[PDB]
A paper describes a structure:
The serine-rich repeat (SRR) glycoproteins of Gram-positive bacteria are an expanding family of microbial adhesins and virulence factors. Three of the SRR proteins (GspB of Streptococcus gordonii strain M99, Hsa of S. gordonii strain Challis, and SrpA of Streptococcus sanguinis strain SK36) bind human platelets through their interaction with glycocalicin, which is the carbohydrate-rich extracellular portion of the platelet membrane glycoprotein GPIbα. Among the best characterized of the SRR adhesins is GspB from S. gordonii, which has demonstrated binding affinity for the sialyl-T antigen carbohydrate decorating platelet glycoprotein GPIbα. Binding of these SRR adhesins to platelets is a high affinity process, with the interaction between GspB and glycocalicin having a KD of 2.38×10−8 M and appears to be a major factor in the pathogenesis of infective endocarditis, since the loss of GspB or Hsa expression results in a marked reduction in virulence.
We sought to identify the details of the interaction between GspBBR and the host receptor sialyl-T antigen. Dot blot assays using immobilized carbohydrates have demonstrated that GspB has high fidelity for sialyl-T antigen (i.e. NeuAcα(2–3)Galβ(1–3)GalNAc), one of the major carbohydrates on GPIbα, while Hsa binds to glycocalicin via either sialyl-T antigen or sialyllactose (Neu5Acα(2–6)Galβ(1–4)Glc). Site directed mutagenesis and in vivo studies in a rat model of infective endocarditis verified that this carbohydrate binding site within GspBBR mediates binding of S. gordonii strain M99 to sialyl-T antigen, the host carbohydrates of the platelet membrane receptor GPIbα, and intact platelets, and that this interaction is important for virulence. When PS2116 was tested with PS846 (M99ΔgspB) in this model, the strains had comparable but reduced densities within target tissues (as compared with WT M99), indicating that they were similarly reduced in virulence. These findings indicate that the predominant property of GspB contributing to the pathogenesis of endocarditis is its interaction with sialyl-T antigen.
Residue numbers in the entry: 399 to 521
């Protein structure tokens, strides 16, 4: 397996101050096999949910040949509204990833996107 996994995540997901939310991403791979421990939802700079979105939670569950990545949490009532770019990163059993931190950063400079990138919109 040299072929990377593919995340399907909505390009925008909208959450609301004071409310709980739940959205999903799904993941396929040519090998149908994954490293779930290395499948995460994170911001650019580190494998963390990110400043201003520390309450962004996720879980990863395999069902058949797909991963189901639940993206969920409770938005604090006093969170800053606006847009937050975040990433679903998946890893196949062979260690291929859909996007690396370096690919994410280069896309950010160039005003573009990588597979698994999404916009978290807080209202
Ligand atoms: C601080 C800085 O300019 N660092 C750049 C770095 O820039 C970040 O790149 C991100 C890529 O995921 C985003 O483009 C960040 O911008 C936004 C975002 O997440 O979309 C803009 C939003 O308007 C802003 N939201 C609010 C409510 O202010 C968010 C938010 O501050 C952050 O997500 C943190 O929660 O930020 C952008 O800041 C990137 O361009 C790299 C490339 O190497 O270079 C510097 O590190
Ligand atoms: Mg693969």
């Amino acid at each position: 397996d040299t072929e990377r996994p593919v995340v399907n995540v909505p390009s925008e997901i909208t959450v609301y101050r004071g409310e709980s939310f739940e959205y999903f991403a799904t993941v396929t791979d040519n090998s149908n096999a994954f490293d779930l421990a290395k499948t995460v939802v994170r911001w650019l700079y580190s494998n963390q949910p990110g400043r201003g979105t520390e309450w962004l939670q996720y879980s990863v569950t395999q069902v058949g040949n797909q991963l189901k990545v639940r993206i969920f949490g409770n938005v604090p009532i006093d969170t800053t509204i606006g847009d937050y770019t975040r990433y679903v990163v998946a890893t196949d059993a062979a260690g291929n990833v859909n996007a690396t931190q370096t690919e994410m950063g280069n896309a950010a400079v160039d005003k573009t996107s990588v597979n698994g990138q999404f916009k978290l919109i807080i209202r």
